Design a protein around this ligand. Structure first.
Ligand SMILES: CC(=O)N[C@@H]1[C@@H](O)[C@H](O)[C@@H](CO)O[C@H]1O
Ligand SMILES: *[C@@H]1O[C@H](CO)[C@@H](O)[C@H](O)[C@H]1NC(C)=O
Lengths: 48, 40, 226, 225
């Protein structure tokens, strides 16, 4: 029931539930980010 | 032209008389040109 | 695009009828050169010549068209100033790395940064030109040839810098190196004549050998323009 | 996309009817290729074959379509010049951090610059190619494998550069490293002062690790066959 008029109005709502196949962003984004993320703790092993 | 001048300067800094030969004229001009530019 | 950015481009225009053919309407020209006195000038592209002629097909006989040719020419100043001058000012530092001494600790900075500036210029020249795979421009051939010269200088620079830092206790190395590499040098035109100072005089021979054969190909391959 | 960019695509083109169907109109073909008489040549892509089929569904029997297939070969020069030549000229410097001696202090510059240049090329072949996850092209797979090889090299290079700069004032010294690293040498075909013996162990452990990189780099590039 809407704001203007005093009758009620039907409608049909469609819902679409979609997933993302994840291998492309796995092989191109979190492999280099997680691969250079293991280099952060390394500089303390290096002699001064 | 500054990078060509500083690779020549960095070449002439690290010489030594075991591996090089001092110029037979460089002493007069460079101990002449240090008090023209107010340096020792 | 072979003589970029000095080339002489050619762009045509076909006027053909649309629903009719050769036995119904017939396109006749009126003036061999199309009219050009309402032209505002164009800034970059000047117009050299502009003819137009009638084509008709001798084995089809349902085909008339009138084709115009535009022969346009670049004015070459702006692309010279922005992409020939910084290209040449970068690529003259290829031969510079052998004139460093090895003791400074600054070889690898120079030759690695020269390789990365060269591949950035190769990608931007390849973003200007079309992706027609028939032909390359002369800028792309020259930049790819000086990039393979720079990575050959990477490999011989790390072999020189391994030869320099040896020691009397670790490296012995045998008679051959003494016999060859204290006789090679006055045929390389030096002027010279106790193992820790022997190894640095091995290292200052071999890059002076490699400065001779890398100023060789830089004036040999650059008359591959001609 | 698996053989990018030497690939051979296959692009479909369907034609149906819009209002009618098989019990009112009936599509049929004339000749079994499309006409290539007014095809001007294109530049980038080049055609090979253009077959035409008529399909029909035997479980429905109210459905015709005429589908053409275009089988296209890409001219491979442009992406070779921009993408294959700097990739091979950068991945030819992966195994060259080991031959570099540890005194000069230049291992980190060479190995960090190789790792960042391979990551920049991996993001360019990310931004060109379509983001399907049904397949992965062979250039990105090979660049990811040599990226894994370069970061294994940077962890073992910082361990070699730690073990070079020890001294008898700091490190106690253990005789286990004498019995391992003076037996190791004729298995690596060498020949040959408490402070200077630590400079000899770091000239062995890299040249062990040079020999297992050339074991790997002529096993991976052999494995693309
Ligand atoms: C080389 C190749 O596989 N081409 C195929 C063709 O054989 C097939 O008829 C069509 C539909 O799948 O798609 C394309
Ligand atoms: C310009 O292009 C047209 C179309 O191929 C050709 O007929 C003509 O000869 C060309 N002229 C020049 C000078 O390249």
């Amino acid at each position: 029931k809407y704001e203007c008029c005093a009758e009620i109005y039907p409608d049909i709502t469609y819902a679409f539930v979609i997933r993302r196949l994840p291998l492309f962003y796995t092989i191109n984004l979190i492999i280099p980010c997680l691969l250079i993320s293991c280099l952060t703790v390394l500089v303390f092993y290096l002699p001064s | 032209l500054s990078i060509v001048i500083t690779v020549f300067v960095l070449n002439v800094h690290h010489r030594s008389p075991r591996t090089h030969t001092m110029p037979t004229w460089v002493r007069r001009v460079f101990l002449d040109i240090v008090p023209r530019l107010l340096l020792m | 695009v072979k003589h970029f950015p000095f080339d002489q481009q050619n762009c045509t225009m076909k006027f053909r009828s649309w629903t009719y053919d050769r036995t119904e309407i017939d396109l006749v020209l009126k003036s061999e050169v199309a009219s050009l006195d309402d032209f505002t000038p164009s800034g970059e592209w000047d117009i050299v010549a502009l003819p137009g002629r009638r084509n008709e097909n001798p084995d089809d006989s349902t085909y008339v068209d009138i084709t115009y040719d535009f022969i346009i020419r670049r004015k070459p100043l702006f692309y010279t100033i922005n992409l020939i001058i910084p290209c040449v000012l970068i690529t003259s530092l290829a031969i510079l790395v052998f004139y460093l001494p090895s003791d400074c600790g600054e070889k690898m900075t120079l030759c690695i940064s020269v390789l990365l500036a060269l591949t950035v210029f190769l990608l931007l020249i390849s973003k200007i030109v079309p992706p027609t795979s028939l032909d390359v421009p002369l800028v792309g051939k020259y930049l790819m040839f000086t990039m393979v010269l720079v990575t050959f200088s990477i490999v011989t620079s790390v072999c020189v810098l391994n030869v320099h830092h040896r020691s009397p206790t670790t490296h012995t190395m045998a008679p051959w190196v003494k016999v060859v590499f204290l006789e090679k040098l006055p045929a390389l035109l030096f002027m010279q004549q106790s193992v820790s100072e022997d190894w640095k005089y091995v290292a200052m021979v071999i890059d002076r050998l490699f400065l001779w054969i890398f100023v060789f190909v830089c004036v040999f391959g650059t008359i591959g323009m001609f």
